Design a protein around this ligand. Structure first.
Ligand SMILES: Nc1ncnc2c1ncn2[C@@H]1O[C@H](COP(=O)(O)OP(=O)(O)NP(=O)(O)O)[C@@H](O)[C@H]1O
Lengths: 553, 64
């Protein structure tokens, strides 16, 4: 008698109350119920991201079942929960005769299957005829992915099935559903939770957690945090618990800088960010303001919740532009990996893989996968218009919404991410800014120039576009002096113990000679090694000029 | 001084050229530890020849 075998009623557990109460879903349930109440297409299904609380509905279902919130028709029904596995004879049979049993068993339950919904090789009809019985109320679900592939092939799968959005919360209600935690979940590991330790884990895990899910990722760390607060306390008086400890500390697990996690969130960062940029690059006060000044606008919901942060930058690579976000990200997202590379040389058609794609090794792509990897990101576009009509059209969604369907068709939020265009479209007009135009005219000259390669939608959805214009030696030597700063702070700190000297030669050279007008100090950036680091280390590496000593050319 | 002679006599024989582009890192590996010399082949390449490594600001080459 195969009833209980992989089919384990949890309305048992629900009658047992083993199952876990939460809020609001009646909406999906009542429908999905009502779906289960349908002669025609019975089977409600959640299509999309895993781990979104599917059987948690089935819980609520089972709850509504055992609560007799289960409506009339199906009150007799309940749910055996399948356990999808067996030992090979082969598996199918065991998974089949049940199917007979249960409709024979007279609708005391329904079945839920979760993401595992099978395109079998030997497909034939697996459970399908049983499903096809004009009978056999069931509950399936899967991500969009399989939903893409398998269930669309028939589509009279739906004749049985019903898709429903995998229900992904709002943060506030995630916060709220995890706000119900504070009186209750303070004492799970035996403390209290402040308003401090309360909302942020979300706000954090939202902002700071790459992977898990809105109440999930949020509810995760606090108990992951309790290693200290639960165990070291009873190992001392802490009653209430605080954000940082519970979170930022235990958030600093991954990276660190809880102060930037905490002591400043976005507020001051912007407030001075102008010069903070100027810190990294003096000059281009325009974008020093603008993009910054802009991207300040980017947040705070002045405009669309769905909305990207988008710019083309103009100048001579080795102007600091390609860097620039890495400051900004390091300034904002506290990272340079947020910066992500889109090579418009690479772009013709076939790229639709390389982001991500519905995989037909043709497998998971990268670039969207990278934000899919890196939910907070900065997107760099390598001489944009050098790309083909290929990406720029998908760039619409990038132009859109700050959210991106992967090539398997899975959206990911860029409104929390950055997108930045590169082009030479003013190269000649850089040469015009070499003549140092009223920038308007030459930017107009550029604007028209850049106007050409793109439909305005491209042109319009950009948060803005800025030149990084002719760079006076002012910046250079500063930037150079900044350029100076980077190596020395790598080494005297730990490695080289190094005190320094500068002839004005190098001071002038590097600025004069090392900086190229057109190709920039960008090579000098490498040369700064060569004629200096390469040179003087080589001078010093003997040690006869001692440690901490210095000899400039 | 530290540089030496490389001279690419181009035999190109999927894109079979990007090899010629991939080597631009291999010299960048050496970090301008050589020089390149190309003789009578100077033309639109793929696409344009050379520069992105030179256009990186790097890469002493003997042009002809
Ligand atoms: N004005 C500048 N301010 C700051 N860094 C600069 C500047 N000009 C050049 N650099 C340096 O050059 C690089 C940044 O140049 P950038 O304008 O961002 O284009 P780039 O693409 O990064 N150069 P490259 O990536 O090799 O093509 C970094 O190594 C910077 O240190």
């Amino acid at each position: 008698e195969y009833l209980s075998k992989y089919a384990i009623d949890m309305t048992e557990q629900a009658r047992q109350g083993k199952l876990d109460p939460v809020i609001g879903r009646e909406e999906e349930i009542r429908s999905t119920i009502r779906v289960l109440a349908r002669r025609i297409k019975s089977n409600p299904c959640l299509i999309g991201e895993p781990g979104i609380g599917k059987t948690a509905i089935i819980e609520g279902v089972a709850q509504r079942i055992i609560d007799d919130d289960v409506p009339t028709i199906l009150q007799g029904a309940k749910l055996f929960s399948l356990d999808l596995a067996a030992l090979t004879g082969d598996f199918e049979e065991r998974f089949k005769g049940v199917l007979k049993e249960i409709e024979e068993s007279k609708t005391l339950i329904v079945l839920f299957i979760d993401e595992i919904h099978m395109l079998m090789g030997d497909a034939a009809n697996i459970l399908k005829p049983a499903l096809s019985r004009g009978q056999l109320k069931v509950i399936g679900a899967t991500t969009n992915n399989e939903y893409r592939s398998i269930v669309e092939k028939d589509g009279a799968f739906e004749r049985r099935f019903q898709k429903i959005e995998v229900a992904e919360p709002s943060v506030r209600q995630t916060v709220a559903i995890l706000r119900g935690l504070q009186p209750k979940y303070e004492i799970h590991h035996g403390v209290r939770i402040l308003d401090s330790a309360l909302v942020t884990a979300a706000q954090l895990a939202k902002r700071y957690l790459p992977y898990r899910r809105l109440p999930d990722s949020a509810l995760d760390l606090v108990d992951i945090s309790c290693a200290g607060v639960a165990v070291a306390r009873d190992s001392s008086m802490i009653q209430n618990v605080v954000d940082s400890d519970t979170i930022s500390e235990t958030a600093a697990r991954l990276t660190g800088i809880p102060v930037k996690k905490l002591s400043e969130s976005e507020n001051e960062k912007l407030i001075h960010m102008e010069r903070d940029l100027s810190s990294e690059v003096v000059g281009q006060m325009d974008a020093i303001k603008a993009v910054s000044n802009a991207v300040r606008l980017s947040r705070s919901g002045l405009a669309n919740p769905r909305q990207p942060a988008s710019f083309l930058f103009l100048g001579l690579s080795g102007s600091g532009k390609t860097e620039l976000a890495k400051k900004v990200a390091g300034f904002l997202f506290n990272d340079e990996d947020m910066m992500i590379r889109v090579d418009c040389s690479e772009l013709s058609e076939k790229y639709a893989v390389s982001k991500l794609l519905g995989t037909t090794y043709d497998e998971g792509g990268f670039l969207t996968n990278q934000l899919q990897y890196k939910p907070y990101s900065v997107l760099l576009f390598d001489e944009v218009e050098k790309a083909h009509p290929d990406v720029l059209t998908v760039m619409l969604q990038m132009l859109d919404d700050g959210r991106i369907t992967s090539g398997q068709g899975k959206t990911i939020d860029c409104s929390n991410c950055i997108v930045i265009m590169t082009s030479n479209l003013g190269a000649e007009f850089i040469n015009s800014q070499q003549g140092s135009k009223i920038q308007e005219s030459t930017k107009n000259l550029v604007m028209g120039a850049v106007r050409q390669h793109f439909r305005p939608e491209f042109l319009n959805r950009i948060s803005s576009i800025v030149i990084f214009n002719k760079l006076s030696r002012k910046a250079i030597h500063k930037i150079v002096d900044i350029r100076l700063k980077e190596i020395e702070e790598r080494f005297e700190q730990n490695d080289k113990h190094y005190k320094l000297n500068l002839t004005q030669e190098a001071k002038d050279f590097l600025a004069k000679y090392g900086y190229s007008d057109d190709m920039g100090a960008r090579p000098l950036n490498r040369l700064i090694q060569n004629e200096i680091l390469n040179k003087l280390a080589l001078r010093i590496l003997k040690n006869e000029i001692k440690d901490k000593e210095t000899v400039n050319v």
